[PDB]
Nucleic acid binder design. Structure first.
Ligand SMILES: [Mn+2]
Ligand SMILES: [Mn+2]
Ligand SMILES: [Mn+2]
Lengths: 154, 153
DNA sequence: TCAGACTTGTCCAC
DNA sequence: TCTGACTCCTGTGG
DNA sequence: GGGAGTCAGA
DNA sequence: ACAAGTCTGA
């Protein structure tokens, strides 16, 4: 568990609140238990001209990746454990995306017990909904009701 | 000279590098000596839904204003004296717009000596070009060569 | 099976 | 003369 | 985000 | 920014 410098977390919080994104997703997973996979993603977006800035993040955070998609690049962290460690420390400084961060931390911690009953799983799916609500969601498909419909059919 | 909290400057520098903007503009003006005035602007942009975040920023910086147009609000500061004081403290924490900040500070310090000789004024406008060059400029019209053409008369 | 790497799309928030 | 507040718009980088 | 403009006041 | 996806390994 890496400890991060405070002045680093303070700057990063502002940048994340500006050009970053905290994402919770319910992904279709046929080869699975409830046909639905959960995905948590911390993401920092920036133009490829400044890919170096996002490259620095990989070294400073210690994990994550940088991929290209047009004229724009993104930093990408989805690995649950370093994600929980990173968001735990960044959260006290976030202003605009603090609640999304907290819901993600809360989803991660309740993740193993959500693999049990579908009821507990669907409850966690509703927490995914709230994150999308707090973001500027525009192109969302799979929600908690998309899970319930497939689950009640079973 | 209101001095700002270091933790506040660190967070703000991050938000400025992300959603902020440091703008140097060469505006035309017939009443003015060289037919062109200069304007420096610190700008933080956010949708009106989160205008409150910009409202806090005004109270925190003490100076500035929030303007609305469409679905987006904006904090702005163009008052030279408070802007110079503010950018001075904010500069060391900037990472993506640090060069823009320093150039603006450079322009401001060479401002009273720019209203003198045309050759000096052209040099200051060249600094404005660099700022637009460092930025993601896409709608710029008046450059230093525009001033050059007008100056030859 | 399943989390994690890596890609593609779109609408707007800058 | 001259500055700064204020509005509106484009074209992306988120 | 990063300009273009117009205006009232100083 | 906020999604939507594919596919490979253990
Ligand atoms: Mn933003
Ligand atoms: Mn940005
Ligand atoms: Mn942004």
């Amino acid at each position: 568990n890496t400890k991060y410098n405070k002045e680093f977390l303070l700057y990063l919080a502002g940048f994340v609140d500006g050009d970053g994104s905290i994402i919770a997703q319910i992904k279709p997973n046929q080869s699975g238990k409830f046909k639905h996979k959960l995905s948590l993603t911390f993401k920092v977006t920036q133009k490829t001209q400044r890919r170096w800035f996002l490259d620095k993040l990989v070294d400073e955070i210690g994990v994550g990746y940088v991929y290209d998609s047009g004229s724009v690049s993104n930093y990408y962290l989805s690995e649950i454990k370093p994600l929980h460690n990173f968001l735990t420390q960044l959260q006290p400084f976030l202003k605009l995306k603090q609640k999304q961060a907290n819901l993600v931390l809360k989803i991660i911690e309740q993740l193993p017990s959500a693999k049990e009953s579908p009821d507990k799983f669907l409850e966690v799916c509703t927490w995914v909904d709230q994150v999308a609500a707090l973001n500027d969601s525009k192109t969302r498909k799979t929600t908690s009701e998309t899970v319930r419909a497939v689950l009640d059919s079973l």
